[PDB]
Amino acid sequence: SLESTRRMLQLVEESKDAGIRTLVMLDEQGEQLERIEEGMDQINKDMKEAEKNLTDLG
């Protein structure tokens, strides 16, 4: 029975480490997502201005 508890302890420790790694990497993921979200708005605004200017010139 003691060996059983040892096995559960080891397994739960491993699971906790895996969860910790997932949390940190996902924090990085979210930072990247925020960066791309910031960029796309400027993309769209500049494109809209250029399209309106080109249409007006013609």
Binding site: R6, L9, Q10, E13, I20, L23, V24, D27, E28, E31, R35
Partner: protein, 280 residues
């Protein structure tokens, strides 16, 4: 052969045509066509797994774009040539990457500079077996990332730099980095759990200096936040300190082995414990 021979012949023919065009011109359309066929020949070389020729063609295209009043295309060709040269000669790849970094930072873009510096440092560490240049590159990347308020990337780079510095006998920089990282991570509700580990590492860097410094650092860390007082690591630290104080190496070895049995140890921690036991 099959595809390889045909691809090589086509690439050589394209290179000869580009040489003819550039010698004929010595107008702008001629050089533009020459650089376009240079890029096409580089891609065709990449088809046949001949990285040296593809890198040379990409570098020539970068030079041709540079001689014209264009910069972004030159930087793209530089980074492509460096990536191609990552296989055969790391030095040429490093040169291309530093040129690309300079070009990118000239225009004011700093996000890609950190990635290029990280790639350069990784090449240096893996191929040239050098840590000083890698340390400097990682420090530059961390500063660039922190300039834009990206905390996670800077924290990762600083953690790597601190680990390498502590491996290179330097303790004050490692202790400062660990202290800052732990203090920053403790506040955030997400990364509260891991701070203890950093603290523990810091403690070890303090123990390599002298026992009294380690004891005072442990007391300070415990005072900062009671969570670190968890027996899991604090008990091991106290047992090691007690064994060192009384000049009992058998107890130190027994405690280290008992800790290792339940949970394994890494090369860094193993070497640190070996050093601490040796100095005893």
């Amino acid at each position: 052969g099959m595809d390889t021979s045909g691809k090589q012949a086509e690439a050589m023919a394209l290179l000869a045509e580009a040489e003819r065009k550039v010698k004929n011109s010595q107008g702008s359309s001629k050089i533009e066509e020459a650089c376009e066929i240079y890029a096409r020949a580089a891609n065709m070389f990449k088809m046949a797994k001949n990285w040296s020729a593809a890198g040379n063609a990409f570098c020539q295209a970068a030079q041709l774009h540079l001689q014209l009043q264009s910069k972004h295309d030159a930087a793209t060709c530089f980074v492509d040539a460096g990536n191609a040269f990552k296989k055969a000669d790391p030095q040429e790849a490093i040169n291309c990457l530093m040129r690309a970094i300079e070009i990118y930072t000239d225009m004011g873009r700093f996000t890609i500079a950190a990635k290029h510096h990280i790639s350069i440092a990784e090449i240096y560490e893996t191929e040239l077996v050098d840590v000083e240049k890698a340390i400097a590159h990682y420090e530059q990347s961390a500063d660039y990332y922190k300039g834009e308020e990206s905390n996670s990337s800077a924290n990762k780079c600083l953690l790597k730099v601190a680990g390498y510095a502590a491996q290179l006998e330097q303790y004050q920089k490692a202790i400062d980095i660990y202290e800052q990282v732990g203090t920053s991570a403790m506040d955030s509700p997400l990364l509260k759990y891991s701070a203890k580990d950093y603290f523990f590492k810091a403690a070890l860097c303090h123990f390599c200096i002298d026992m009294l410094n380690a004891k005072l650092a442990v007391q300070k860390y415990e005072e900062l936040f009671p969570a670190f007082s968890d027996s899991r690591e604090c008990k091991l630290m106290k047992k090691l300190l007690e064994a060192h104080e009384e000049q009992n190496v058998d107890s130190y070895t027994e405690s280290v082995k008992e800790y290792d049995s339940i949970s394994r140890l890494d090369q860094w921690l193993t070497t640190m414990l070996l050093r601490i036991k040796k100095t005893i």
